[PDB]
Amino acid sequence: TTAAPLLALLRENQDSVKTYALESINNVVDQLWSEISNELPDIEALYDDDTFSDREMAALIASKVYYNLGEYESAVKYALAAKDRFDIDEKSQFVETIVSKSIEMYVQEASKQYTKDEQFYTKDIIDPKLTSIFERMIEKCLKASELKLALGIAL
Amino acid sequence: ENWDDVEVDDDFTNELKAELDRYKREN
Amino acid sequence: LHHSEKKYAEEDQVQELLKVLNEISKTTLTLDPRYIWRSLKDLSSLRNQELLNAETLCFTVNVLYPDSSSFKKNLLKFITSNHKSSVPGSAELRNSYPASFYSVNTEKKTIEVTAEINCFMHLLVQLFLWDSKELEQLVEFNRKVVIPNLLCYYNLRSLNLINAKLWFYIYLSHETLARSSEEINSDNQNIILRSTMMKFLKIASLKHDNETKAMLINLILRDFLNNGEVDSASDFISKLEYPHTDVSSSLEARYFFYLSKINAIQLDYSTANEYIIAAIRKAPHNSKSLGFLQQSNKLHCCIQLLMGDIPELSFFHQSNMQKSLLPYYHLTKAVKLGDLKKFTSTITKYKQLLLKDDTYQLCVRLRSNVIKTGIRIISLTYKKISLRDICLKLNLDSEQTVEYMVSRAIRDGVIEAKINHEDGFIETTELLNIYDSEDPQQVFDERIKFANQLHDEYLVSMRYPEDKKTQQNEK
Amino acid sequence: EQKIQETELKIRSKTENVRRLEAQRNAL
Amino acid sequence: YFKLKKLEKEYELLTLQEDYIKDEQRHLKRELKRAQEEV
Amino acid sequence: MPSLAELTKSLSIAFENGDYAACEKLLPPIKIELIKNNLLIPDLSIQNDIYLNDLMITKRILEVGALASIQTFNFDSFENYFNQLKPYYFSNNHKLSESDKKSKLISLYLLNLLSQNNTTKFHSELQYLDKHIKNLEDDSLLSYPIKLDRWLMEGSYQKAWDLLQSGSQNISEFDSFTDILKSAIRDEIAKNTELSYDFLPLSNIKALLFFNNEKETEKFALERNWPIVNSKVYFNNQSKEKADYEDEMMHEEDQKTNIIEKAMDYAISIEN
């Protein structure tokens, strides 16, 4: 029900109509993830399309689906793809989870890269998608006068 | 125990023994 | 007279509150208060009847009220309150003590006592609603409160067990409102109710709480069975989010009872037959569980008839529930005897009783099982039987009709026979002597895994009671 | 402490698993 | 709040020390059964 | 085929006059203006618009749109317009819309699930309706797939095949799925004839399986070599028996004793 028929309409024409269809889906992304699970191959197949400009809202839909599917690492990739609809200042359990997973993935990669080069934080060796949330959250803790999260993660 | 109780109807003795009388007369 | 009545129950309420108050302050003791909260439901229900409603009036005056100023007035407005010393501040049990929630530090907002006081306040409110059977506006008014509060309040590991019992009262009070009267505003409350269960379940996934997530699942699976949509329940049970660690004794048989009803229409009775058996062993035998054992045992007898095999009819006799099991005896008897008119006349008179448990829709499909079992009975008796001999025993239509029906029995491998059209008789292809195959090894390989499964369960459980006694000093 | 509190269950889980296997070795 | 990040490393230490003993006890109990049947 | 200025009148007139392919061309321009005003689906809030404006008009548009998609053999359009009718007929509490008014629309989705040989969603939809023993059981339209599948469960295919031929319901609406269900019946019976029937001439193929034109079975005889003389089966109705099954699922027979020995070696990890 609800957005369930709207999931299969993504294969039709009139992409301008799909704009209003994806807005109604944004409400049910946190409600029913079952019907979307079958349409996941179709949602990701439209991301690489150059004629598809809705990838900002399309990545927001899959962000709360794969998250409710039980894959936390997968939801981080869709949240960092659009870099628009994801609200870092929004207070929710969903946003705070991606921040914890993105920083954790940054530590695992930067652990073995410190031996090769110490300038990795100035270069593109590490995915800039992981450094986007990592750099802003540490500076956010500095404005809050919290040295536990800023200095603890840096070590 | 109780399964044998209800499954046994009024058939057999009173019935089948009355058939054995006419069965031997036809042979 | 009325003054001593309010101080007697309030002292016992604080006595039970101080037991769980000091345990949640140091580390996590939450396992201990969970056992106390089990008996708290029974002790509070009996206490609500005594000393009228005045035990909960002075309890709010004792502590600080964040939201509860107008809630007690609205809850007591419907009963046409009789006001005796109703001015707030009449009874003061604090008197500046550390365990009494010291007032000066509380009123200066230098410490926050609201966390444990407010979450516990909503528990006593929901108890009086189910005791007094208060409905209509009082049900919806409390729903607009607790749910927004649970979004703002972030519960710790010990705090997640508070609202875990509150979600059961929200769904229970909602279903009693819909069945009592049908109004245009009834489903407006259910739409938000269905959306709220999915939002809080997302947060409880990271908390890894056993009772919190398992309580919602059994409440969500029941909502899917009322609407009749498997697609929502199919992907919901495939993730395996149901904690298997501690359900206590309440949720053991409730989870397996839903899987038997879902897989019943899936035409797979192999897995569904085990779920209904496990629900019988895990369910307590006491009187409070008789309501569940009544419906569960009625479902088990219907599944066996859908499998094509006649179950044991001795359960309809030796049990003490046979008064309600009488309609199901004539159903199996009609399928076993194969009488066509007996089955049609049986479901006609008892159709009214089968409407309550919604098992009449499965009884309509038992019409086919009458022929399914009738073929199995006549086939095992005669290995080689003529085509016209079956129509004489079961009073079938013609030879072309039975030729199609016998072919339906060996589809799944039930009868395992062959039909000879030129020879004119049906011959059974089962020579037995199955021991020469690998079938004995297939069963023995599972028995070793099942034995080691019970080993793995006993493999690691000992130290749990030994943690407390060995660490503490002994004589 | 989101990761610290989430991984705290692994401490009590592995601790109760190893201690109960020591009683079998201490018996041997 | 200092003990929160300090015990974070201790959590991995307590896990490994219990895993190393669990791995070595399997090789220790094998020699224990050999001495019982030898007597 | 456009008729009047309004897009609704052009769809209703062209629906009863035939040419269901042209009716699907006027559907896209209708949903463009409805989605902007949120008239395509009923809102959860109260807009004070139920049976007025275009919401009642949209109710009829989506109802006739599903019946026009079955004649064009479009599975996606029929499932889309049907799933859009889930908020319809339900909405809030009592019935402000039209679904059960035409009971064939529900059966078209029920018979469409049998086209894919999917019993999971088929048997679940009967529990979705409100009155099971009133509107579902008494009406022969909602009981049409039940009575059709009842003889399939009983095993007799003679009466079940007559519902698709001698019945009067296969003329207009069910004509789309008639030949589809007729192809589903011939894909069921003969699966069992493999082991049970050793041999049989072409007379039983035309009679028991109810085949009309000759040499059409030869089209089913092409690839897997059907000298019908005794038993050539396993082309249609599943497949061959092959041989030498190893290294697929769980335990096998011929080559590997290791996984069989693994059950005996399973106690190694349990004891150690």
Side-chain angles (χ1 to χ4, degrees):
Chain A
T1 187
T2 309
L6 296 175
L7 296 175
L9 295 175
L10 296 175
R11 294 182 182 175
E12 296 301 321
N13 61 345
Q14 295 300 321
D15 290 344
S16 296
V17 178
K18 295 176 180 177
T19 299
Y20 295 93
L22 296 176
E23 294 177 350
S24 296
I25 296 170
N26 291 336
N27 291 336
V28 299
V29 294
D30 59 353
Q31 296 178 338
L32 296 175
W33 60 92
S34 63
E35 296 301 321
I36 299 170
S37 63
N38 291 336
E39 296 301 321
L40 294 175
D42 291 344
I43 295 170
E44 184 178 2
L46 296 175
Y47 176 77
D48 59 353
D49 187 5
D50 291 344
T51 59
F52 180 80
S53 63
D54 291 344
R55 69 171 64 196
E56 294 177 350
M57 294 183 286
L60 178 63
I61 294 170
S63 63
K64 294 177 179 177
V65 175
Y66 295 93
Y67 177 78
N68 290 336
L69 179 63
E71 294 177 351
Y72 297 140
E73 183 178 2
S74 296
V76 177
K77 294 176 179 177
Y78 295 93
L80 295 174
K83 293 177 179 177
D84 187 5
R85 297 295 181 190
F86 177 80
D87 187 4
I88 186 169
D89 290 344
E90 183 178 2
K91 184 177 180 180
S92 64
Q93 186 64 59
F94 176 80
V95 175
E96 294 177 350
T97 301
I98 296 171
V99 175
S100 63
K101 300 302 287 185
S102 178
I103 295 170
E104 183 178 2
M105 292 177 70
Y106 176 78
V107 176
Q108 294 177 336
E109 295 301 321
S111 63
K112 294 177 179 177
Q113 294 300 321
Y114 176 78
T115 300
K116 294 176 179 177
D117 186 5
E118 295 83 358
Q119 295 300 321
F120 59 89
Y121 62 91
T122 58
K123 294 176 179 177
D124 58 353
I125 303 301
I126 295 172
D127 187 5
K129 294 177 179 177
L130 296 175
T131 60
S132 296
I133 295 171
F134 178 81
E135 183 178 2
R136 294 182 182 175
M137 293 300 294
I138 300 301
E139 294 177 351
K140 183 178 179 180
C141 296
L142 296 175
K143 294 176 179 177
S145 296
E146 294 178 351
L147 296 175
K148 180 179 76 179
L149 296 175
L151 296 175
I153 296 170
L155 295 175
Chain B
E1 295 84 357
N2 295 131
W3 184 87
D4 288 342
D5 293 345
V6 178
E7 294 301 321
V8 173
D9 290 344
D10 290 344
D11 192 4
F12 297 98
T13 59
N14 62 346
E15 183 67 15
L16 274 65
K17 295 180 182 298
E19 184 277 336
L20 296 175
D21 291 344
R22 62 180 295 274
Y23 176 77
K24 271 68 180 180
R25 300 290 182 269
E26 294 177 351
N27 291 337
Chain C
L1 177 63
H2 300 290
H3 182 62
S4 296
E5 294 177 351
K6 292 189 295 184
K7 301 292 184 291
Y8 176 78
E10 185 178 3
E11 183 178 2
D12 181 67
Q13 185 64 59
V14 176
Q15 183 64 260
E16 294 178 351
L17 178 63
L18 295 175
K19 294 176 179 177
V20 297
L21 177 63
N22 296 131
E23 293 177 350
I24 62 172
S25 63
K26 294 183 175 74
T27 184
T28 59
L29 294 177
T30 187
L31 296 175
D32 290 344
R34 182 177 64 84
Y35 296 139
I36 296 170
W37 294 355
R38 299 290 182 269
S39 63
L40 178 63
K41 182 173 178 290
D42 290 344
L43 295 175
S44 296
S45 178
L46 178 63
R47 185 180 65 256
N48 289 336
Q49 185 174 355
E50 294 178 351
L51 299 176
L52 296 175
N53 57 33
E55 62 183 342
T56 188
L57 188 146
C58 295
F59 178 80
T60 301
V61 177
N62 190 341
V63 296
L64 189 146
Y65 59 97
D67 58 353
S68 65
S69 64
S70 296
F71 296 162
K72 301 299 182 181
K73 293 184 174 74
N74 291 336
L75 187 146
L76 296 175
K77 183 180 293 296
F78 177 80
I79 61 172
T80 304
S81 296
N82 291 337
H83 301 290
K84 57 179 181 296
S85 178
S86 63
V87 176
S90 63
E92 183 69 13
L93 294 176
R94 292 175 295 181
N95 291 336
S96 296
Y97 293 94
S100 295
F101 296 97
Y102 176 76
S103 297
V104 176
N105 290 337
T106 300
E107 294 178 351
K108 291 166 62 181
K109 302 299 183 181
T110 188
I111 59 172
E112 185 275 334
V113 297
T114 303
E116 70 281 4
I117 293 172
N118 191 30
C119 295
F120 178 80
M121 183 65 73
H122 299 291
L123 177 63
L124 296 175
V125 175
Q126 296 296 101
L127 295 175
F128 179 80
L129 296 175
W130 183 87
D131 290 343
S132 178
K133 301 301 287 185
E134 292 178 349
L135 296 175
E136 296 301 321
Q137 186 174 355
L138 295 175
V139 175
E140 184 277 336
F141 178 80
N142 296 131
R143 182 178 64 84
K144 186 179 179 180
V145 176
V146 177
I147 294 172
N149 290 337
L150 295 175
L151 296 175
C152 182
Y153 296 140
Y154 295 140
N155 297 131
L156 296 175
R157 182 56 57 86
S158 178
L159 297 175
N160 288 284
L161 296 176
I162 296 170
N163 61 345
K165 291 181 295 297
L166 296 176
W167 291 96
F168 177 80
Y169 296 139
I170 295 170
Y171 177 78
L172 177 63
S173 63
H174 186 279
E175 295 301 321
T176 59
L177 178 63
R179 292 192 297 273
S180 296
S181 63
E182 183 68 14
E183 63 184 343
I184 191 65
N185 291 336
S186 178
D187 288 345
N188 289 336
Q189 186 174 355
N190 190 30
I191 295 170
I192 297 170
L193 177 63
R194 293 181 295 102
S195 296
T196 301
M197 296 296 181
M198 298 296 180
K199 293 177 179 177
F200 179 80
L201 178 63
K202 180 179 76 179
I203 296 170
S205 63
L206 295 175
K207 301 292 183 291
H208 295 82
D209 187 4
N210 291 336
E211 183 178 2
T212 299
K213 291 189 295 184
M215 183 65 73
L216 296 174
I217 292 170
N218 289 336
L219 295 175
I220 293 170
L221 293 174
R222 185 176 179 84
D223 181 67
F224 294 160
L225 296 175
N226 291 336
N227 291 336
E229 184 68 14
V230 177
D231 291 344
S232 63
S234 63
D235 182 67
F236 178 80
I237 62 172
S238 63
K239 183 179 178 180
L240 183 64
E241 70 281 3
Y242 177 78
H244 299 290
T245 300
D246 187 5
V247 294
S248 178
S249 64
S250 296
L251 298 175
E252 293 178 351
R254 183 65 65 184
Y255 176 78
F256 296 96
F257 177 80
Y258 296 139
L259 296 175
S260 296
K261 293 166 62 181
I262 294 170
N263 290 283
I265 60 173
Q266 296 299 320
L267 295 175
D268 290 344
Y269 296 94
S270 296
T271 59
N273 190 30
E274 183 67 14
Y275 296 140
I276 190 65
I277 294 171
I280 296 170
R281 294 173 296 180
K282 297 293 180 64
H285 300 290
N286 291 336
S287 64
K288 291 189 295 184
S289 296
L290 188 146
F292 178 81
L293 295 175
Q294 184 64 59
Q295 185 63 59
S296 296
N297 290 336
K298 291 189 295 184
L299 178 63
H300 183 198
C301 296
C302 295
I303 295 170
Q304 295 300 321
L305 295 175
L306 295 173
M307 293 177 70
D309 181 67
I310 301 301
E312 294 178 351
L313 296 175
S314 63
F315 178 80
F316 296 96
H317 298 165
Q318 295 178 336
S319 296
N320 61 345
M321 293 182 285
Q322 76 285 359
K323 294 177 179 177
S324 63
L325 296 175
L326 177 63
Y328 295 139
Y329 176 77
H330 295 82
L331 296 175
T332 301
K333 183 180 172 63
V335 176
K336 183 178 179 180
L337 295 175
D339 187 5
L340 297 175
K341 271 68 180 180
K342 183 173 179 290
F343 177 80
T344 59
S345 296
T346 299
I347 61 172
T348 300
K349 294 176 179 177
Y350 296 95
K351 183 178 179 180
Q352 183 64 260
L353 296 175
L354 296 175
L355 179 63
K356 294 177 179 177
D357 57 353
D358 290 344
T359 59
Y360 176 78
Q361 296 82 1
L362 296 175
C363 295
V364 176
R365 296 181 183 174
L366 294 174
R367 179 61 178 166
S368 297
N369 296 131
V370 177
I371 297 170
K372 300 301 287 186
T373 300
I375 294 171
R376 183 175 178 83
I377 294 171
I378 188 169
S379 63
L380 295 175
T381 57
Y382 300 142
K383 182 178 179 180
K384 294 176 179 177
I385 184 169
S386 178
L387 178 63
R388 292 192 297 273
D389 291 345
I390 296 170
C391 296
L392 296 175
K393 183 180 172 63
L394 296 175
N395 290 283
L396 296 175
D397 291 344
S398 178
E399 296 84 357
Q400 295 296 101
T401 300
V402 63
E403 183 178 2
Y404 296 141
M405 294 185 287
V406 176
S407 296
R408 180 59 179 165
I410 60 173
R411 297 286 295 175
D412 291 344
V414 176
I415 304 302
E416 185 67 14
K418 62 180 179 296
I419 295 170
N420 296 131
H421 182 62
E422 295 83 357
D423 290 344
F425 59 89
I426 295 170
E427 183 178 2
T428 300
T429 59
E430 182 67 15
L431 296 175
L432 296 175
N433 296 131
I434 61 173
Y435 176 75
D436 290 344
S437 296
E438 71 281 4
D439 290 344
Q441 293 179 336
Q442 185 63 59
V443 177
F444 295 160
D445 290 344
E446 294 178 351
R447 294 183 181 276
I448 296 170
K449 294 177 179 177
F450 294 159
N452 290 336
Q453 183 64 260
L454 296 175
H455 296 164
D456 290 344
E457 294 178 351
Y458 177 77
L459 178 62
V460 207
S461 64
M462 63 175 285
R463 180 63 177 166
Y464 177 78
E466 294 177 350
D467 283 340
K468 295 176 180 177
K469 271 67 182 180
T470 58
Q471 292 178 336
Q472 293 177 336
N473 190 30
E474 294 178 351
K475 294 176 179 177
Chain D
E1 61 184 343
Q2 294 177 336
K3 183 178 179 180
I4 295 170
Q5 185 63 59
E6 183 178 2
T7 58
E8 184 178 2
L9 293 175
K10 293 177 179 177
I11 302 302
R12 294 182 182 175
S13 178
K14 301 299 182 181
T15 300
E16 294 178 351
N17 290 336
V18 62
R19 292 182 181 175
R20 299 179 186 170
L21 295 175
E22 295 301 321
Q24 294 300 321
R25 182 178 65 84
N26 290 336
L28 295 175
Chain E
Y1 295 93
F2 177 80
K3 294 177 179 177
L4 296 175
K5 301 299 183 181
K6 183 178 179 180
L7 295 175
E8 183 178 2
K9 179 61 174 172
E10 296 301 321
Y11 295 143
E12 294 178 351
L13 295 175
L14 295 175
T15 300
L16 295 175
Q17 293 177 336
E18 294 176 351
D19 290 344
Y20 296 142
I21 296 170
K22 183 178 179 180
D23 291 344
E24 295 301 321
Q25 65 180 19
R26 292 192 297 273
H27 300 290
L28 177 63
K29 63 181 179 181
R30 183 180 65 256
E31 294 177 351
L32 296 175
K33 294 176 179 177
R34 294 182 182 175
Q36 294 178 336
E37 294 178 351
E38 183 179 2
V39 176
Chain F
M1 177 178 71
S3 178
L4 296 175
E6 294 178 351
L7 296 175
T8 300
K9 302 299 183 181
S10 296
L11 178 63
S12 63
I13 294 171
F15 177 80
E16 294 177 351
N17 290 337
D19 187 5
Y20 295 92
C23 296
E24 294 178 351
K25 294 177 179 177
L26 296 175
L27 296 175
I30 293 171
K31 63 182 178 181
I32 294 171
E33 294 178 351
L34 296 175
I35 191 65
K36 294 176 179 177
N37 291 336
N38 290 283
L39 296 175
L40 178 63
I41 59 172
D43 291 344
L44 296 175
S45 63
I46 295 170
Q47 294 300 321
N48 290 336
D49 186 5
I50 295 170
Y51 62 91
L52 295 174
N53 291 337
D54 290 344
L55 179 61
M56 177 178 71
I57 295 170
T58 302
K59 177 181 75 179
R60 182 177 181 172
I61 295 170
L62 274 65
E63 183 178 2
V64 297
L67 275 67
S69 296
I70 61 173
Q71 295 300 321
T72 59
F73 296 96
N74 189 340
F75 295 159
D76 291 344
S77 296
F78 177 79
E79 293 177 350
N80 289 337
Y81 296 141
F82 178 81
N83 291 337
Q84 292 177 336
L85 295 175
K86 293 177 179 178
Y88 294 93
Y89 178 78
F90 178 80
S91 296
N92 189 30
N93 291 282
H94 60 78
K95 272 68 180 180
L96 58 82
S97 178
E98 295 176 350
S99 178
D100 184 67
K101 183 178 179 180
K102 182 180 293 296
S103 296
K104 294 176 179 177
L105 176 62
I106 296 170
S107 63
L108 293 175
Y109 176 77
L110 294 174
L111 297 176
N112 190 30
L113 296 175
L114 296 175
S115 64
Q116 294 177 336
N117 193 30
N118 189 340
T119 59
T120 61
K121 295 176 180 177
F122 176 81
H123 302 292
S124 178
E125 183 67 15
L126 296 176
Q127 295 299 321
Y128 176 78
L129 295 176
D130 290 344
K131 302 299 183 181
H132 298 165
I133 61 172
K134 302 299 183 181
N135 291 336
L136 187 147
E137 183 67 15
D138 291 344
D139 187 5
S140 64
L141 296 175
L142 296 175
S143 296
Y144 177 78
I146 295 171
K147 294 177 179 177
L148 177 63
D149 292 345
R150 181 177 65 84
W151 292 95
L152 297 176
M153 294 177 182
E154 293 177 350
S156 178
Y157 296 92
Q158 185 174 355
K159 180 62 174 172
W161 182 88
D162 291 344
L163 296 175
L164 295 174
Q165 185 64 59
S166 64
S168 63
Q169 296 300 321
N170 63 345
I171 295 170
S172 178
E173 294 83 357
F174 295 161
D175 181 67
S176 178
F177 296 97
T178 298
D179 290 344
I180 296 171
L181 294 175
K182 291 165 61 181
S183 64
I185 294 171
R186 59 177 182 183
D187 289 344
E188 182 179 2
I189 297 170
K191 288 180 176 178
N192 191 31
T193 60
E194 297 174 350
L195 296 175
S196 63
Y197 295 94
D198 291 344
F199 59 90
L200 57 83
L202 296 175
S203 296
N204 291 336
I205 295 171
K206 183 178 179 180
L208 297 175
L209 296 175
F210 296 97
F211 294 161
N212 189 30
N213 59 344
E214 63 183 343
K215 293 177 179 178
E216 183 66 15
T217 302
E218 183 178 2
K219 183 178 179 180
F220 297 159
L222 295 176
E223 295 178 350
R224 275 173 291 186
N225 190 29
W226 286 80
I228 311 298
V229 294
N230 291 283
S231 179
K232 297 299 180 292
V233 192
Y234 297 141
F235 170 84
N236 188 338
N237 292 279
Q238 193 63 259
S239 179
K240 302 298 287 185
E241 296 301 321
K242 188 60 175 172
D244 290 344
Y245 295 93
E246 71 277 1
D247 291 342
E248 183 66 15
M249 293 291 109
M250 294 177 182
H251 301 289
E252 295 302 321
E253 297 302 320
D254 188 6
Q255 64 177 20
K256 60 186 183 69
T257 309
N258 292 335
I259 296 173
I260 295 170
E261 184 179 2
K262 183 178 179 180
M264 295 184 286
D265 291 344
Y266 177 78
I268 295 170
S269 63
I270 303 301
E271 294 177 350
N272 291 337

